[PDB]
Design a protein around this ligand. Sequence first.
Ligand SMILES: Nc1ccn([C@H]2C[C@H](O)[C@@H](COP(=O)(O)OP(=O)(O)[C@H](Cl)P(=O)(O)O)O2)c(=O)n1
Ligand SMILES: Nc1ccn([C@H]2C[C@H](O)[C@@H](COP(=O)(O)O)O2)c(=O)n1
Ligand SMILES: [Cl-]
Ligand SMILES: [Mg+2]
Ligand SMILES: [Mg+2]
Ligand code: NA
Ligand code: NA
Ligand code: NA
Length: 326
Amino acid sequence: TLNGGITDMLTELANFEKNVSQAIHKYNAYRKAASVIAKYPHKIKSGAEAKKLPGVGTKILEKIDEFLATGKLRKLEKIRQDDTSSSINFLTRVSGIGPSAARKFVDEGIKTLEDLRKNEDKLNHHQRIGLKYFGDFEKRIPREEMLQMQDIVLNEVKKVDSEYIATVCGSFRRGAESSGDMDVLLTHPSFTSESTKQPKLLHQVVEQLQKVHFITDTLSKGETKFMGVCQLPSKNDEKEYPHRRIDIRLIPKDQYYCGVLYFTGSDIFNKNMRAHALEKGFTINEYTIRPLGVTGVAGEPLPVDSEKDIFDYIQWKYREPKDRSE
DNA sequence: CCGACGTCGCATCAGC
DNA sequence: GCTGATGCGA
DNA sequence: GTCGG
Ligand SMILES: Nc1ccn([C@H]2C[C@H](O)[C@@H](COP(=O)(O)OP(=O)(O)[C@H](Cl)P(=O)(O)O)O2)c(=O)n1
Ligand SMILES: Nc1ccn([C@H]2C[C@H](O)[C@@H](COP(=O)(O)O)O2)c(=O)n1
Ligand SMILES: [Cl-]
Ligand SMILES: [Mg+2]
Ligand SMILES: [Mg+2]
Ligand code: NA
Ligand code: NA
Ligand code: NA
């Protein structure tokens, strides 16, 4: 794209601040700046031009000037050369290893892929599966594969109970030609904001997907959120498909629109929209939009009958899913 | 200047 | 066991 | 790191 060099630089800085510095707000600031520059429809000529965008300030403007003049950023060149930062950044690429566990592993001399495989007994379950599928989980999913996966999930869910509705969200719902994983929103009329009239609603679906060998591993699992591993079936003599991350979120059926707004994302779009809600005097989660009293405490849920109702409350024009890929 | 920055599910741990 | 952080993830 | 009161 037009400003790929700048946005990659800001993303690398974002990852440093999260993984090494453990500075969650600097991480989000860099990602917000990279996102707003990514959708800017001109090739940026100067830091000053970029600083006009919301989320770009004086410091990123200076870095943009350095990068435009030299093609690189000295601050990043040094980070790339630091072994502890290098080790930490690698270890956090394993699902289940975060900034804290990464730094503890390096303290103990566990810093490479051979180190990890040599010490499986020092990994919790999630980390163990992330290491197992380390290569697969960095591969992207062609939309064609997402379509075959959607068909399995939708048909298997239908076999459990035809009253389930499963909706693939994430980047797939935003129309992306490839996705990092599969996100499935799930509803069933027995689970509403007012009652749960049937247990094991999420479990039953997971069990059925395991029994047809679509779901292969479990990272975490509770009553409303499954986080796991899935894999398409391959034909005779075919090489196997890579294993894929899958997330399944069971949402109260009457709160579907807030739930599908949340799970469609992107993450940055949700942050921006929820931040706008707060400025407008509302708070949004995956269940409800509520007003804020002068108090500061959230009031009662407002009526929502479409995704667009949520946008209307905060005085945003509606944005189709394909336009939320911030 | 400086407080706020989105919001929450599940796993793990510490204190009682 | 419970409860309230903290980690890591969506 | 950036924003807004
Ligand atoms: N920090 C986050 C992460 C995710 N989310 C929401 C929004 C996101 O679209 C949805 C699924 O999480 P993913 O990490 O899979 O994001 P996607 O938008 O699907 C990525 Cl573009 P992907 O295609 O690489 O998976 O969960 C969020 O609200 N906050
Ligand atoms: N997973 C889903 C998807 C849609 N729905 C409901 C919400 C609306 O009444 C309707 C939306 O239909 P559609 O968005 O496919 O046009 O179906 C649901 O209850 N659970
Ligand atoms: Cl709520
Ligand atoms: Mg996804
Ligand atoms: Mg603010
Ligand atoms: Na700006
Ligand atoms: Na990780
Ligand atoms: Na996901």
